[PDB]
Amino acid sequence: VLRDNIQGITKPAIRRLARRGGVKRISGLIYEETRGVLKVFLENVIRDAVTYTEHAKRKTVTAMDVVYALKRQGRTLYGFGG
Amino acid sequence: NIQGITKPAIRRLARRGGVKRISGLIYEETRGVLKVFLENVIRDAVTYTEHAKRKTVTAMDVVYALKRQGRTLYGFGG
Amino acid sequence: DEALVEELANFRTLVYCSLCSKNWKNMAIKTCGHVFCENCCKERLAARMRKCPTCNKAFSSNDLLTVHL
Amino acid sequence: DEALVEELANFRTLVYCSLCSKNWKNMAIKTCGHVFCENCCKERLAARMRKCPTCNKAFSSNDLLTVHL
Amino acid sequence: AKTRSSRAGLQFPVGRVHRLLRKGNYAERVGAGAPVYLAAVLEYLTAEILELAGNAARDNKKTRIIPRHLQLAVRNDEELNKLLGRVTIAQGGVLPNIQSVLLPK
Amino acid sequence: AKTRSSRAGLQFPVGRVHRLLRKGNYAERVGAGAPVYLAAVLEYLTAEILELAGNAARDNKKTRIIPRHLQLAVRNDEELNKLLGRVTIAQGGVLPNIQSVLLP
Amino acid sequence: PHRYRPGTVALREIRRYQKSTELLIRKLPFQRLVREIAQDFKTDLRFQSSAVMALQEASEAYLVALFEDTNLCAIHAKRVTIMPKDIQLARRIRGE
Amino acid sequence: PHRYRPGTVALREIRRYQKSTELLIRKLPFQRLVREIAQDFKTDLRFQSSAVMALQEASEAYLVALFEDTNLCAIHAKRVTIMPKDIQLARRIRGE
Amino acid sequence: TRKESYAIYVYKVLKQVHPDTGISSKAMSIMNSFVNDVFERIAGEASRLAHYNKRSTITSREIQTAVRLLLPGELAKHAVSEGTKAVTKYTSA
Amino acid sequence: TRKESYAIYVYKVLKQVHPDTGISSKAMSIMNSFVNDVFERIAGEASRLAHYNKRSTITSREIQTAVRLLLPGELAKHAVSEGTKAVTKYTSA
DNA sequence: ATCGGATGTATATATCTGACACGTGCCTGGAGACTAGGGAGTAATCCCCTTGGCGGTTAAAACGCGGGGGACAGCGCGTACGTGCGTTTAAGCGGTGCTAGAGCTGTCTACGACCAATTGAGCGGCCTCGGCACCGGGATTCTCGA
DNA sequence: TCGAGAATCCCGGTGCCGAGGCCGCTCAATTGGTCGTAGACAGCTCTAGCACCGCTTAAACGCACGTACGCGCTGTCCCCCGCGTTTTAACCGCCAAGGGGATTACTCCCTAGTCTCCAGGCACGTGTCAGATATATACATCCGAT
Ligand SMILES: [Zn+2]
Ligand SMILES: [Zn+2]
Ligand SMILES: [Zn+2]
Ligand SMILES: [Zn+2]
């Protein structure tokens, strides 16, 4: 079993994304908000991917399932065979 | 033309929106926003009605054009 | 068994009507939610009084409901 | 003995919620007059099961009424 | 003779759904248990919305449903609102609310 | 035995497009002049952005096209940016800009 | 005579218009606007009666929803008055 | 000694990170997070190697765009420091 | 000419959850246009989902897994149960 | 087994506008997906556009209208002009 | 505004490795030629719905005036965040084993399309009456200047 | 504070048009057979996903110091809201004319389906040079003492 893995998104990793977004100063409470937002976003995609996998009577999640799940909610991704 | 969208009508729309105080430069911008929105839909409606060799814009073309833009509309058929 | 007797008495205070003390609580008003027995309330109304015995809230005839258990 | 124990159990069943058996009865239904606990009531409403468990006629969210004692 | 809807204990037309599925360019061939499955879901959704609409109508001392009641029923339920997040209902109106900051002090 | 593409004067395959249209559940029948028209549009659309990508690649003293050049070509054209609105490109990066108030 | 402090009357129209359902723009000047906008795409057109009603019904909801969103932007900057620089921010964030 | 004023190093970092195209998060922690998240929908699944790569590639542009909108929200209120209010307002306006 | 509609079935359903209640014409039209939209939304997903797995027949399973993809929350599970019960009753002829 | 793609046609087109530049392996799989996406969008629009008028065949006019409905601004004005000429040449031979 | 010291950044020179570009056989999908039948183009009509014009009411729009509340600029202060250094942790890389499960092949059977004959469900027309819009009455709550 | 002015309030009438029910008549859904292909199942191959170990060494982490910025307060003034008076044109009812939308025959030609034939594109193998890495050097840039 796995637990307490959301803390792998450390402070420097979030701050690098913020810099790539183009921000100068960062408050001290942004990190918890970002972790919550990312955790909420991941589940929606993963649930649809698992549903697609379960329908085809398989046991491994392939890249095609992820591409289809992402496209299903207007977030199409180029460059992975889709 | 565009001057028929009077200031009191914009005030009523804003009041239904829920605002309490309105500046003086809002009307001239709301008119420009509305004109662009109308232009975006009329073109698709006219294209739909021209593909079918018709000459009058029916109520089905408008709802089809609205649906294709992401905003559907119930209560006018289909 | 003093504790059990006290528990039973406390429960009896809850189930039995406070003022009449001889009839089960089967009467309610929506104004405040205070629950009494059915027998008491018609005499209280016939007293031409509209004051809640507990929180003095005004009530009328249409603010009267039956409850079960 | 058991007679006072049986009376205490009779009061025990009536005092607390018949569904969750843990909380005070404080929620009432205007339609049927039955009383349950608020904790069960929210989770029954959120499960799209708007129907009384006992008398089985439907009710809405606004039919919930808070009561005391 | 005996209709398929009666056999399945339903209220929506199974045969019309079957024909609509067949003549809609969805696949080469359709199964024999798909219309029965779909007609039940459609009826369940219809009854679910229609009950809330009737409750909203009754709360307003009326006895006939109008589009305002449909809008009120839809926008007060979280899942129903999420399902119809990008749909506008004609002659619906809005939900009465006011921000707390604008309230008088 | 000339192919249909050579007759039309294109580079994309007319016959494969026609087969894809037929066995795709779009309609009962497919016209004779539909695959030609559809291929002539796809060819123009793909030839439109390759030139811009090559222009963006020549400015970095490079002679090959990597996804960054495609991203730069797409995001720098107004009409082309609307087509690929809600589309993300792998290994693309972002367009360099900074808010004016943040500068000293 | 009698007067009302600035603000109390504006709080009553909010309650009044959030309970009604009719249209808020006069019909004839709106129809004369669409009939002129549609004149460049193709000339000598005719409109069904319900098409204009559908267009107006679609426009009102869009305008009301945008006016609801700009209020949050106005509040965010510690203000009560909405200004043209709020509509632009709302439209930018929306994706226009 | 030598010391830069507060603000120039961040400005240089902005330029440095807006020119390269790489992945800003680690790889082991992200995969360990994905597996834990997915383990509560169906037990003992398996993940193809490119599936995790696609998930991580898709999950970073979202955060970058959200921060880009948060910056505008913060600037609108005459500030240069982003706060959770800006994130909440941006997600509210976007429709989430 | 003839025009198909769902008005009669909608009224028949309404007379089951509210024995004494009516409906206006505009509300009837709105409810008619709602079913036609939900039906198309559900049916369009099953076609794509059957095309993905290189099949030619759409059966009850495609509808079953499309309902779970479109409907959110408790709605999906309630609809799935209601559909499954009807299907299992129909086949016991 | 085999698998079709548009790689050779994309390379052949590229060798006409930039006779010296090459293309990376990862950048080819992006164009190969872009063409598929555009083709699917246009075909899906044309199908329902033909269905609205109670027709049963897809001709050049349907996709000519779909192009005008999809592509924004000047792009459409060029794409149409690129299509029709091809057709007429195909008719001449 | 001035320059000087120190730091991070752009430019020209080896070298070297793996991915891009080209050549080969072989199928399997695309081209040629022919037939049959239904989908669509064309002509005629007829009646519904769109446009255009007139006159009267009166509800809504336009204009001016007065004043008070909210927007905006300037100051002061104290905490939270950026920068730099030394120490601690685990990510990344390589190499080796083992096996579960994805992918392909061959048979065979139940299931869905297609056709012909019947008849009851559902649609278009036609009354009719009652739910809803408009009018005053006597029961409890707004509000702002003292 | 508490009284005056504008806004509730439950409840017995009056009138109208659209929602609800009934009837006649098609034509779409139901029954009953027949047949051929899709898909379900058993078997086998081999590949790639999971697990372990050992060694750099890059990056996360914790601490201290100083300062730029967020936030609260005060003052001014100007512009937006309320209210009364006058001018406009929207709305409603009525009439009249004709364009084009929708339906019905009739025919012809365009596309699906079949068979035969063979050239294009896909999997596989091989060579070599474009770009990554390392390095010395010149140059722009930032901050401080003046
Ligand atoms: Zn009592
Ligand atoms: Zn009380
Ligand atoms: Zn309980
Ligand atoms: Zn009950």
Side-chain angles (χ1 to χ4, degrees), chain B:
Chain B
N1 51 85
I2 201 54
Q3 292 302 129
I5 309 315
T6 48
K7 157 176 151 176
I10 289 172
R11 270 167 92 80
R12 287 195 290 263
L13 288 171
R15 292 295 200 252
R16 169 170 285 175
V19 308
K20 191 173 126 179
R21 208 170 206 255
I22 309 191
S23 153
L25 317 176
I26 282 283
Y27 317 121
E28 264 324 315
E29 171 128 46
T30 311
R31 293 178 187 137
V33 158
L34 175 65
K35 175 201 281 303
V36 161
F37 173 81
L38 274 186
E39 276 181 15
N40 264 7
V41 184
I42 292 286
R43 159 141 36 74
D44 292 18
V46 166
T47 290
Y48 268 110
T49 197
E50 182 176 310
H51 171 51
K53 308 268 194 30
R54 242 188 281 115
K55 275 149 151 302
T56 79
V57 183
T58 78
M60 264 321 185
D61 317 338
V62 178
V63 53
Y64 286 158
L66 276 161
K67 154 172 271 293
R68 97 168 305 281
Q69 301 220 329
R71 21 184 78 96
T72 86
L73 173 96
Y74 287 176
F76 279 93

Side-chain angles (χ1 to χ4, degrees), chain C residues 17-21 23 36-40:
Chain C
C17 181
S18 74
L19 266 65
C20 82
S21 52
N23 327 297
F36 324 100
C37 90
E38 187 192 17
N39 329 122
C40 284

Side-chain angles (χ1 to χ4, degrees), chain D residues 52-67:
Chain D
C52 168
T54 67
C55 89
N56 186 271
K57 29 192 164 34
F59 63 99
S60 66
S61 36
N62 82 282
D63 293 278
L64 296 178
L65 173 34
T66 166
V67 301

Side-chain angles (χ1 to χ4, degrees), chain G:
Chain G
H2 185 221
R3 202 153 257 278
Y4 271 136
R5 315 252 313 280
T8 168
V9 173
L11 258 169
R12 274 202 317 249
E13 308 170 4
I14 301 196
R15 310 203 186 101
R16 155 142 85 108
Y17 288 122
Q18 255 167 19
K19 183 198 331 146
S20 99
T21 53
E22 81 295 20
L23 302 188
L24 308 153
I25 306 200
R26 314 253 70 81
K27 304 222 201 293
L28 252 67
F30 182 88
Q31 157 173 171
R32 270 191 327 249
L33 169 64
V34 86
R35 217 178 274 281
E36 159 197 337
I37 277 188
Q39 192 173 51
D40 321 310
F41 305 146
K42 171 141 159 42
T43 165
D44 321 63
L45 271 185
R46 289 153 116 80
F47 280 83
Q48 260 187 16
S49 296
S50 36
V52 163
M53 282 298 102
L55 268 164
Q56 160 155 24
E57 188 102 11
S59 294
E60 311 285 19
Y62 173 74
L63 269 188
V64 155
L66 172 77
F67 265 132
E68 180 166 345
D69 271 354
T70 167
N71 194 27
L72 296 191
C73 292
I75 292 204
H76 186 68
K78 284 182 281 323
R79 267 199 332 262
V80 170
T81 319
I82 63 188
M83 268 155 207
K85 82 195 211 163
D86 303 355
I87 296 186
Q88 288 156 49
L89 171 74
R91 290 226 302 155
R92 164 51 181 91
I93 285 187
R94 262 161 153 217
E96 266 88 324

Side-chain angles (χ1 to χ4, degrees), chain B residues 69-73, chain E residues 75 81-88:
Chain B
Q69 301 220 329
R71 21 184 78 96
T72 86
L73 173 96
Chain E
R75 300 284 176 226
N81 174 31
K82 205 181 309 148
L83 179 56
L84 308 173
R86 315 214 41 90
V87 164
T88 87

